[PDB]
Amino acid sequence: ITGTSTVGVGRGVLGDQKNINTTYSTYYYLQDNTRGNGIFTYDAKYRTTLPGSLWADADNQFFASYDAPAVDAHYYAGVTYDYYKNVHNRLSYDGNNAAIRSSVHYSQGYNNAFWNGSQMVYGDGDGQTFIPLSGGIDVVAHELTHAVTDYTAGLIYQNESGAINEAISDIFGTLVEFYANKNPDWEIGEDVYTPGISGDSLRSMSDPAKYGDPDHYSKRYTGTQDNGGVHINSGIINKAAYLISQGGTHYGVSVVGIGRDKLGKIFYRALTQYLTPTSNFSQLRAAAVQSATDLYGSTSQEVASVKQAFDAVGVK
Ligand SMILES: CC[C@H](C)[C@H](N)C(=O)N[C@@H](CCCC[NH3+])C(=O)O
Ligand SMILES: [Ca+2]
Ligand SMILES: [Ca+2]
Ligand SMILES: [Ca+2]
Ligand SMILES: [Ca+2]
Ligand SMILES: [Zn+2]
Numbered sequence: 001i002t003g004t005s006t007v008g009v010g011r012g013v014l015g016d017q018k019n020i021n022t023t024y025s026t027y028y029y030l031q032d033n034t035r036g037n038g039i040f041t042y043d044a045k046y047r048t049t050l051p052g053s054l055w056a057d058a059d060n061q062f063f064a065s066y067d068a069p070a071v072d073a074h075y076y077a078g079v080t081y082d083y084y085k086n087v088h089n090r091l092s093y094d095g096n097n098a099a100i101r102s103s104v105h106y107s108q109g110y111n112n113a114f115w116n117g118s119q120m121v122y123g124d125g126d127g128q129t130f131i132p133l134s135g136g137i138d139v140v141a142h143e144l145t146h147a148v149t150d151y152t153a154g155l156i157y158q159n160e161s162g163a164i165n166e167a168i169s170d171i172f173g174t175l176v177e178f179y180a181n182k183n184p185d186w187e188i189g190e191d192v193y194t195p196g197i198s199g200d201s202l203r204s205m206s207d208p209a210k211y212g213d214p215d216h217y218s219k220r221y222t223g224t225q226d227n228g229g230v231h232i233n234s235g236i237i238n239k240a241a242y243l244i245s246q247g248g249t250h251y252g253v254s255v256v257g258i259g260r261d262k263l264g265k266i267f268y269r270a271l272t273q274y275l276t277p278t279s280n281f282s283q284l285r286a287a288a289v290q291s292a293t294d295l296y297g298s299t300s301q302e303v304a305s306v307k308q309a310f311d312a313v314g315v316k
Contacts, residue, residue, distance in 0.1 A: 010062025
């Protein structure tokens with residue numbers, strides 16, 4: 001909508017107060033004009049018609065229970081935009097400042113969030129399995145990273161290419177969570193999963209097998225569920241990424257960690273310069289090796305650690 005840029009205030013899903021960028025034209029809308037061609041947040045009103053209505057508020061205060069998922073979708077889309085611009089020099093998901101659109105209050109009791117090819121979509125959860133999923137910065141950043149991937153490598157969402165697609169979303173979702181630096185970890189979705197249970201998450205990058213996911217190629221899933229295991233086999237790559245950053249010894253193979261910033265640089269370059277729609281795990285290792293060689297040199301510690309991490313998880 002055409003209007004003037006304003007700054008509202010509200011509370012997110014976890015009860016934290018934050019300032020949001022809004023637009024005033026009769027109502028105050030969740031339209032942030034400060035980032036690219038805008039960040040836009042919509043109300044799906046418990047239905048499944050998308051995007052729904054651009055979020056309108058009479059007073060620019062967003063403290064109602066019903067407001068909280070909107071606040072967080074809007075705010076955390078902004079953080080994710082800032083991460084890509086400031087860390088990777090990328091302007092929105094398409095690299096040309098595409099508008100970022102999100103809808104909240106999708107369906108009733110909907111225990112998921114997704115990128116639909118055009119926008120973000122967030123359920124409210126059923127209140128037991130999940131609370132509203134935009135409350136997780138890693139969740140928001142995971143979903144927006146699918147848009148990045150789709151515009152860049154274009155990894156097909158099945159089998160090994162799909163597990164890479166998922167791992168890239170977990171990797172950058174985590175790196176965004178560290179960038180914001182509130183309560184960061186190498187777990188996925190802990191802030192919105194199972195409010196009645198402390199210390200769990202959907203997936204772990206540091207120890208995928210904590211939630212039943214493989215941490216070595218020899219344990220890969222080859223059945224048909226989950227698009228050939230895209231959220232299962234992602235654990236193999238997630239573990240490799242964790243080892244590259246943090247180091248460790250895994251199945252007897254020791255990796256020297258090189259830290260989060262270098263992990264991000266290596267994987268961002270692989271995603272944007274080397275991976276293709278049909279890349280498999282072997283080809284990801286090659287892409288990451290080439291990326292780290294470009295950035296650091298063939299005889300670098302960074303290259304050595306990339307190779308050691310893939311070796312550790314059985315990917316040649
Ligand atoms: C990043 C988390 C987000 C919910 C994502 N769409 C996801 O990982 N979903 C998988 C895990 C289950 C989510 C709720 N049932 C999924 O398999 O869809
Ligand atoms: Ca209000
Ligand atoms: Ca956390
Ligand atoms: Ca996390
Ligand atoms: Ca929990
Ligand atoms: Zn995903």
